[PDB]
């Protein structure tokens, strides 16, 4: 467990951590929606929690876009570490949600794309308000006033106008707060793109 961005060293570190998360789980427990913040009394992984968080963060983000196995294992270990009962603060899962959303809008690589989708969906089923606040609201904000625009995620990488709709279709399938607020906001945007804009396919896709 030493900081490393090399594909081999970081990959072996992550696949090792994949067994220590399982040992920690078997020894202590897993998340419940009531135990989202409750930590276990004592362990040595808490002393190493900052190091594993940092190595996972640099394994997914602040990393090259060509990493398919590295980023897939990164989001997988992020999700598995989230799966522990209240051992990561809402700040940590917020950072993880932001990482997933940024790396899923930036890269089209369906490996990292669908792995980030899986991570975001698991966060949604284990953290309603967190995902709805960071990922869902941002994604609803990327879409503009007028239809048929380039959804500029950043200076260069952009997604389609229907990419937001597809992402909305992906999760919120079982998240009450997410799905209700999403229905409300999609109705709001339907009204807006019909009133201040003149579009048909966007209204059709939204409805």
């Amino acid at each position: 467990l030493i900081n490393t961005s090399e594909v081999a060293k970081l990959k072996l570190l992550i696949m090792n951590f994949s067994f220590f998360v399982d040992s920690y789980i078997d020894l202590f427990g897993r998340t419940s929606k009531e135990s989202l913040g409750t930590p276990v009394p004592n362990n040595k992984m808490a002393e190493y929690k900052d190091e594993i968080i940092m190595i996972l963060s640099m394994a997914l983000t602040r990393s090259s876009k060509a990493e398919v196995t590295i980023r897939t294992l990164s989001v997988i270990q992020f999700t598995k570490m989230i799966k522990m009962k209240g051992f990561l603060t809402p700040e940590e899962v917020s950072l993880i949600i932001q990482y997933f959303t940024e790396e899923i809008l930036t890269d089209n690589n369906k490996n990292i794309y669908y792995a980030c989708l899986e991570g975001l969906k698991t966060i949604s089923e284990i953290y309603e308000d967190l995902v709805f606040e960071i990922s869902l609201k941002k994604l609803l904000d990327l879409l503009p006033d007028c239809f048929e625009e380039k959804i500029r995620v950043n200076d260069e990488e952009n997604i389609h106008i229907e990419t937001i709709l597809k992402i909305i279709l992906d999760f919120t399938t079982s998240r009450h707060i997410l799905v209700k607020e999403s229905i409300t906001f999609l109705a709001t945007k339907l009204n807006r793109v019909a009133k201040i804009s003149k579009s048909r396919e966007y209204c059709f896709l939204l409805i």
Binding site: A66, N108, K110, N111, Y113, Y114, A115, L117, E118, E156, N158, K166, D170, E201
Partner: protein, 203 residues
């Protein structure tokens, strides 16, 4: 380069007027090996360029060019190129032309029939893409959805039960406009796909 990529299908097509037809022998300088040869000359460079490219335009060009080349060449006749083709193969599953759609669906069929490590490592990525293919869309024809059903069946057969159990409910849920669409072979085969997915998950 975008126009060249979209026009690049021309190099590999049937002629129906200049081949070594029965009877005629003075038809042309016919060579049947043009397809495969052209693929072997194009694919490799294309894929290297795609993995060495960043943006919307040039990567879309590489995908469209390699897809428009692979669509006319038989997928089972181009085997060594499949391994490096798998990334662009997975890429070519979302674009307007149902021609590239049927071609890439056929190519994943052949790949998952031959390759299994790629399929096992990429199932968590391919499955929702095939789901979006099976969804009704301005680009998903009824035939396209039928082919997505066929690939879903083939990948569920090839992938072991471990991952297939994790991808039963999504296929069962996101197929309701396919067993109720305008055509009925689409409907019958979606009913069969739903039933086979249900029986594979329940066992």
């Amino acid at each position: 380069g975008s126009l060249v990529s979209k026009l690049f299908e021309v190099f590999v097509m049937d002629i129906s007027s200049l081949k070594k037809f029965k009877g005629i022998s003075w038809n042309n300088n016919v060579k049947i090996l043009y397809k495969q040869k052209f693929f072997g000359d194009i694919f490799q460079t294309l894929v290297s360029n795609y993995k060495n490219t960043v943006d919307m335009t040039i990567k879309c060009n590489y995908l469209t060019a390699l897809s428009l080349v692979l669509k006319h060449t038989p997928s089972q006749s181009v085997g060594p190129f499949i391994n490096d083709l798998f990334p662009l193969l997975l890429q070519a599953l979302d674009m307007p032309d149902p021609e590239v759609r049927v071609s890439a669906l056929e190519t994943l069929k052949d790949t998952t029939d031959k390759h299994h490590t790629l399929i096992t490592e990429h199932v968590s990525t391919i499955v929702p893409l095939l789901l979006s293919l099976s969804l009704p869309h301005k680009y998903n024809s009824v035939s396209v959805r039928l082919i997505a059903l066929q690939l879903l069946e083939m990948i569920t057969t090839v992938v072991p039960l471990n991952y297939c159990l994790s991808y039963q409910d999504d296929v069962l849920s996101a197929l309701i406009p396919v067993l109720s669409d305008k055509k009925r072979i689409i409907r019958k085969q979606c009913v069969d796909t739903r039933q086979v997915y249900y029986e594979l998950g329940q066992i």
